[PDB]
C-alpha cells in the first residue's frame, strides 16, 4: 500500500498533465447559437476615462432608474469617470454574468 500511494501520487500528476488538441474539423450545427460579446467594439462608446457623454446619463439617471432593470443597466452603464482614484466596485458585473449565463 505504500507503493500504491506512491503510484497514486505520480498518477495524479500524470493524468492531469497529458492533453491533446486535434486538427481542423468544423461543426456545422444549426441549433448551436454562438454569438460574440456585445459592446466589445463599443468601448469608446463607454465614457470610461474622464469623457463627456456619460454626463447625459447624469441627466437621464432618474430616467434610467425608473426603467426596467434590463433597460436600467445599459442606461446606467456609462457614468461619470472621475479619475484613477475611484472605481465603484462592480455591483452590476455579477448580474451581467448571470444574465449572460441565462442567455446561454
Amino acid at each position: 500500500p505504500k507503493k500504491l500511494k506512491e503510484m497514486k501520487x505520480x498518477x495524479x500528476x500524470x493524468x492531469x498533465x497529458x492533453x491533446x488538441x486535434x486538427x481542423x474539423x468544423x461543426x456545422x450545427x444549426x441549433x448551436x447559437x454562438x454569438x460574440x460579446x456585445x459592446x466589445x467594439x463599443x468601448x469608446x462608446x463607454x465614457x470610461x476615462x474622464x469623457x463627456x457623454x456619460x454626463x447625459x446619463x447624469x441627466x437621464x439617471x432618474x430616467x434610467x432608474x425608473x426603467x426596467x432593470x434590463x433597460x436600467x443597466x445599459x442606461x446606467x452603464x456609462x457614468x461619470x469617470x472621475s479619475a484613477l482614484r475611484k472605481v465603484p466596485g462592480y455591483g452590476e458585473s455579477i448580474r451581467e454574468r448571470f444574465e449572460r449565463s441565462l442567455d446561454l
Binding site: X27, X40, X48, X51, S101
Partner: protein, 341 residues
C-alpha cells in the same frame, strides 16, 4: 417529436433535473422544448453514468454516516472515481483554433471568480484554482509580451491579445470586495466555471508546450509572499513583434505604493520593463527613471525621475507608440480617453 418537454427528457434519462441542467450547459445542448436526436446522443454518456454512480455513492455515504462507521466512509471517499470533463472538450472543440476562438468567454468567468471572495457556496479551493489558472494565463502573456489593446473603464479592464490568430477579449474587474448578489444562483456559474476551467486548462497545456516550456509553472514561495500575481511564477525554458512587444525596452519604472499595482504591473510585463513598488519593498533604486503615480503633491521631486500619471501607459499601448508626458505629469488634466473601439 422535435420538441421534448424537460420533464419527459429528464425522466427518460432518469437523471435529476439540476444535473440535466448541468449536462445541457455542459455539452452545449440547447432548446422546455428539446431536440429528440440530441437527447438520443445524450442517452449514452459515461459522465451521466458517473453522475448516477455519485448519487448512489452519496446514498452509501449516508448509510455510512447513519451507521456511524467513519472509517468505511473514509474508504468510500478515498476509493472514489471522479468524472472528468475532458473528452467532450476534445470532441466538442477538435480544432484547436476553435478553442482559441471560444476561450474568450472562458477566460472572463474565471477572472471574475478569481476576483471573488470566499463564500460558503463557492469553495476557496474553487477560488484557489481560479486565481492560479488566471495568474498562469497572465504569466503566459508576459512571456511573448503580445497584447495590443488596452481599455480603462468603470466596467472592467478589457484586454484583447493578438495570439495565434484572433485577439482575445478578456477582462479583469478590480480587486475590490464586492457585495454578493442574493439574486444570482451559483449552481449554473459553477458548471460554466468547471467546464471553462478544464477547457482553459488543456488549452494552457497546448500553449505552454507549444511555447516550448514546462506546463506546470513553478513559483518561489517567498516571491508569492511578496505578491500573489503572475510575477510569482518563474517560467522555464524547456523575435518579439514590433512595436508593442518590447515597447519600453530597457526601461525601468518606479510604480508607487499609491498606484493600483496589478494592471500596471501586467502592462509593464507586456512591455518587458521592470516593476519597482515600495509596497513590495516594505515586506522585506539606482536605475529608476520614471514614477507612475497619481498624487497632487510629490515629496522628493527628483528632476532626474519622470513623474507620470498612469494614463500614459494606457495611451502609449493603445497607440503602440510614445507620446509626450506633459499631460501625464501631475497634476495636469488628461485627454478623455476613448479606446480603439
Amino acid at each position: 417529436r422535435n420538441f421534448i418537454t424537460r420533464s419527459q427528457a429528464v425522466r427518460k434519462l432518469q437523471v435529476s433535473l439540476a444535473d440535466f441542467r448541468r449536462l445541457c450547459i455542459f455539452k452545449g445542448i440547447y432548446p422546455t422544448f428539446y431536440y429528440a436526436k440530441d437527447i438520443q446522443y445524450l442517452m449514452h454518456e459515461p459522465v451521466l453514468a458517473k453522475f448516477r454512480e455519485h448519487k448512489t455513492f452519496a446514498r452509501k455515504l449516508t448509510r455510512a454516516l447513519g451507521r456511524g462507521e467513519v472509517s468505511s466512509a473514509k474508504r468510500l471517499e478515498e476509493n472514489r472515481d471522479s468524472y472528468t470533463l475532458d473528452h467532450i472538450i476534445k470532441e466538442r472543440y477538435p480544432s484547436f483554433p476553435d478553442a482559441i476562438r471560444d476561450i474568450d468567454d472562458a477566460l472572463n468567468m474565471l477572472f471574475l471568480f478569481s476576483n471573488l471572495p470566499s463564500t460558503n457556496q463557492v469553495s476557496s479551493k474553487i477560488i484557489n484554482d481560479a486565481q492560479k489558472i488566471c495568474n498562469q494565463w497572465l504569466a503566459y502573456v508576459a512571456k511573448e509580451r503580445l497584447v495590443r489593446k488596452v481599455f480603462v473603464s468603470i466596467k472592467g479592464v478589457y484586454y484583447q491579445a493578438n495570439i495565434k490568430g484572433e485577439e482575445v477579449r478578456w477582462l479583469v474587474p478590480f480587486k475590490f470586495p464586492e457585495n454578493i448578489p442574493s439574486d444570482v444562483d451559483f449552481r449554473i456559474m459553477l458548471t460554466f466555471l468547471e467546464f471553462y476551467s478544464t477547457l482553459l486548462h488543456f488549452v494552457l497545456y497546448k500553449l505552454y508546450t507549444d511555447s516550448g516550456l514546462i506546463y506546470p509553472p513553478k513559483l518561489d514561495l517567498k516571491k508569492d509572499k511578496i505578491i500573489s500575481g503572475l510575477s510569482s511564477y518563474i517560467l522555464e525554458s524547456r523575435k518579439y513583434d514590433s512595436p508593442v512587444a518590447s515597447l519600453f525596452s530597457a526601461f525601468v519604472f518606479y510604480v508607487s505604493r499609491e498606484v493600483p499595482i496589478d494592471i500596471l504591473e501586467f502592462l509593464i510585463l507586456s512591455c518587458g520593463g521592470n516593476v519597482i513598488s515600495e509596497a513590495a519593498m516594505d515586506q522585506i533604486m539606482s536605475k529608476v527613471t520614471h514614477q507612475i503615480v497619481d498624487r497632487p503633491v510629490l515629496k522628493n521631486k527628483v528632476a532626474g525621475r519622470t513623474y507620470i500619471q498612469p494614463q500614459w501607459i494606457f495611451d502609449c499601448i493603445n497607440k503602440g507608440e510614445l507620446v509626450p508626458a506633459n499631460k501625464y505629469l501631475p497634476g495636469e488634466a488628461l485627454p478623455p480617453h476613448l479606446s480603439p473601439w
